[PDB]
Amino acid sequence: AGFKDLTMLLDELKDMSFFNKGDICLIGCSTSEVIGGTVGSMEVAETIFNALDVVSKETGVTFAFQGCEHINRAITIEKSQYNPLTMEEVSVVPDVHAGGSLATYAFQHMKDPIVVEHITVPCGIDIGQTLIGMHIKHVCVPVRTSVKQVGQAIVTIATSRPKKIGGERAKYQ
Amino acid sequence: KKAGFKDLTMLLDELKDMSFFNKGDICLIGCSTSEVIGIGTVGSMEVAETIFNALDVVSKETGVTFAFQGCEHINRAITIEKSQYNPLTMEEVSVVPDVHAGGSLATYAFQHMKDPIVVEHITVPCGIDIGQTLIGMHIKHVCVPVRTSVKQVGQAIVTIATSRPKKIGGERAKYQ
Amino acid sequence: YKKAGFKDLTMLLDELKDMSFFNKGDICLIGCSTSEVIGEGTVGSMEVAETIFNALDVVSKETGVTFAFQGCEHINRAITIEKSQYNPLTMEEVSVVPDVHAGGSLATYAFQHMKDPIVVEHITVPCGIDIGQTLIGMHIKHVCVPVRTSVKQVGQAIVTIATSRPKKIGGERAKYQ
Amino acid sequence: YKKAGFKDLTMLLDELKDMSFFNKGDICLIGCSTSEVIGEKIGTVGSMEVAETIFNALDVVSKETGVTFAFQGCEHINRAITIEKSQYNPLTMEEVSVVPDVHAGGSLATYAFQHMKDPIVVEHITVPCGIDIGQTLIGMHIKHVCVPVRTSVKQVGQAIVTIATSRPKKIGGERAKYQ
Amino acid sequence: SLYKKAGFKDLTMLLDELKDMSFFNKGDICLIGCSTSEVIGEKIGTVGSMEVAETIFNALDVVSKETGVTFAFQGCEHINRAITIEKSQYNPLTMEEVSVVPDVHAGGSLATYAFQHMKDPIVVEHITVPCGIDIGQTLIGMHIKHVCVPVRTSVKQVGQAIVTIATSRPKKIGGERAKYQ
Amino acid sequence: YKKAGFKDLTMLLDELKDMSFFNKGDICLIGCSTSEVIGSMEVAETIFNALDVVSKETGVTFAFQGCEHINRAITIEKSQYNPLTMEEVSVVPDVHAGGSLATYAFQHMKDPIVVEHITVPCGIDIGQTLIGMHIKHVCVPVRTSVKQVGQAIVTIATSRPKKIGGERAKYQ
């Protein structure tokens, strides 16, 4: 099911250099979409969190976890990734029914978690159509993958690239 | 039996019934006509036409207006009627959407608007994404997905977003 | 004589009127702690809120100024205003219903007695009145200028009055008249 | 000093009119150094005479085209801009407290302030076009993207003149179309 | 010696109280708003007002060395409440240097004293800091990081000047189901 | 000295050096129209190379404004890119879409990037391309005895803080 699909998706992304040292990658997830209760949903969250952590150690990318709309899509990150110049800490503690399973799991298992109101990151992974485009550095570009689902959840992968500028005579090489 | 038409008509009727379209709002459309089919410019422009025309019916019924996201080659710049341009919140840019640099629907919309202009960025209260082009960068915070019984338009996955204010306040705060 | 703070507030408002503090079309931000007025309970606090809200409404009708009500820190000092004063260009609506223990007595009273209330995250206004040292400076248009009044308290609450004026710019040779 | 620059300025303004540079309802920013027009340091009487001639020529254009003018002050007043209050937009501009003087603001800004119906000074401004007489620099005030305008009249008296208009950013990759 | 002593005991007690409630954190900036005339309770000349400024500055400096907090000094409205800080605390990313030199009659006594006794002073147009102390109702809330929270103290005055203390904390967010622990 | 602009530019740069215009760690923005100098890649080369000498002597670095066809986007070394204050854009300056100097600079930098906007403390405009949009407020023109580079009018800008305060304010 979801574990096999996720493992394959992550290996594919690694192989296409989607995960870059020092980048933050935003995760949008709905564990219920993966399956199609809080015990079960937290087990899925655990598996996803742990798989992402392996990728983090292999590639040097770090992950940020989007909460659900009840907490205004506020984002859980490690304090070591907090930049006060670009981010604003907010007070809330993600819960299964107010944040969602993965953000809740991430908060509980981080060394020093904090929640920020907004974030801009160069890439992200959306599992189950929660939407993540508000978080991706302009210009947001979808990434085609061979693995299109994690369990029963549609997956969307986004990267980013600079705006192209200039008129008819402009060159790009 | 024209590609997408029946699914789109059903989706729009559903949205109407849930008061998704409000008089005076702008609704952003993200579309990939190739996703609807699953391939040339003739065919893609025919799909664009059907989508544009269905949206126009909704516009006349509800008083909502539509904005059309271009593809990444033109930096997702947005085509709108000049009557909806607000210089205080939007920045006009120079480009003319083309099938191979903008995409079929943005190109069709540009050509069939009374007085089109293209803006670099936009913030709108709701939107419809046909074919996973992504539209969340355009939706007023906080963006809320809308569940519909119609999941596809032709072969294209469809995503619907509305918006609502940030909920603020600590443990003792009230919301009614 | 029936209401705590009423005489002091009436005198303060008359003074402010006389110094042209209240201008047609301006928004004036009110910061209030009703417990400070009494000197430290929901019945009593709501009575004070009522008196303040009602007195301010009279001023509004006389001068054409409108009032915005700051909430407590539990609602992030969010501001309650009439929807007719909402400007989407400069303000951001947020979802919260002020309550006595989550917003404060005056914001709660104002919310319940407005025609069409909304709450915004932040606001910038040309003047304001702080009853009981809640602080209002974050809301006042730069440059914020304190206004001296002969009325220093409303009941037991210290009162602070702020207006605003443009930044003064220019080097040593600059002129100002 | 009452005649200095007059012929050149009049010709430059007529040229600009003829190329539709002045549009009804637009604001055009003026940067001026009256000493550059003469070509030497001149005293306040002379400098104010040059300011008067420039102001009056601009006013004729204003009445003919419906454009309005904004006047940049010198660096001593932080390049603050003098405009008619009727053109103040609090959403985009910030009023500042200063009264332009010949030795703190410059002759033209001072003259403009004194002869406007209801002048105010703002800290910054963004406008679609402008005219710089004597290389005071005005590009900080012009809407992006700022585009120099070629003119047949290149000087007003001894002052180099720079004319700027504006146009949208051109965007898109190599496949993008502009017509 | 009147003006050299005025406010000293009250200020020292206020600062000890604040220390005890962990108000002063290493590496934070604390904004000071002051009116020396309020401390005395009447208009006073420049000699006297500068003596009060000295006493305040010196008391704050003791706290600075003990806690590792640094102080920023708000000027009066004549200089648009511009703020005097040590250059070591200047962050060009978040602050904008302006040109003015605080004077007793254009800046106020404390900002003037601070400017003259700093190692390398700079004046900035605006600042956002996590906490502050207002002596004499000059208002300081425009400088405090959102969300600004008043701090209750048992010391209510420094001499004759009403004292207000502010700290800051993050916005609380989320709906009715949200958790904060 | 016969190479177009070279003598005038060398004198201008020496003058500026002598008035401490070039400071270690500053970025200086160059606006150039090589056609104005003459009346184009050879001129660009001479300018770029002269500026590079100054860079090594003073520790200032240079940023090169492109023409209006590329929205005055600015070419800089990546080592000077600050993502907090600048935004990378995709374009490669060309002689007919960027101008000769920006084109030359792009091709001869170690690791060039183009940014949409920039704010720098000082700049040099050769041929009235305009550069004031890039200069830190408050922008102050600098008078030089060298008025032209070849046939191109030259403008020099530095910057200083806003002066603030009312009539009683002091500035020393």
Numbering used by the authors:
A (entry chain E): -1 to 34, 38 to 174
B (entry chain D): -3 to 34, 37 to 174
C (entry chain B): -4 to 35, 38 to 174
D (entry chain C): -4 to 174
E (entry chain A): -6 to 174
F (entry chain F): -4 to 34, 42 to 174
How did the manuscript describe this experimental structure?
We determined the X-ray crystallography structure of YwlG to 1.75-Å resolution and did not detect bound PLP or other ligands. The fold of YwlG is characterized by a central eight-stranded antiparallel β-sheet decorated with three large and three short α-helices with an unusual 12-residue-long carboxyl-terminal extension. The oligomeric state was determined by size-exclusion chromatography (SEC), in which YwlG was eluted with a size corresponding to a complex equivalent to a hexamer. Consistent with the SEC analysis, the asymmetric unit of the crystal was six protomers that made up two stacked trimers. The carboxyl-terminal extension appeared to interlock the oligomer. Analysis of the multimeric state of the protein showed that the hexamer was a stable composition, with a solvent-accessible surface area of 39,710 Å2 and a surface area upon hexamer formation of 12,540 Å2 (estimated G: −56.6 kcal/mol). We replaced the invariant residue C69 with a serine because C69 was oxidized in the crystals with unknown significance. The hexameric structure of S. aureus YwlG remotely resembles the structures of members of the catabolic, NAD-specific GDH family. First, YwlG is half of the typical size of a GDH and lacks the N-terminal catalytic domain and ligand binding sites. The inability to detect PLP or other cofactor binding in the YwlG protein crystal could be due to instability of YwlG in its PLP-bound form or the missing component(s), e.g., HPF, in the heterologous E. coli from which recombinant YwlG proteins were isolated.
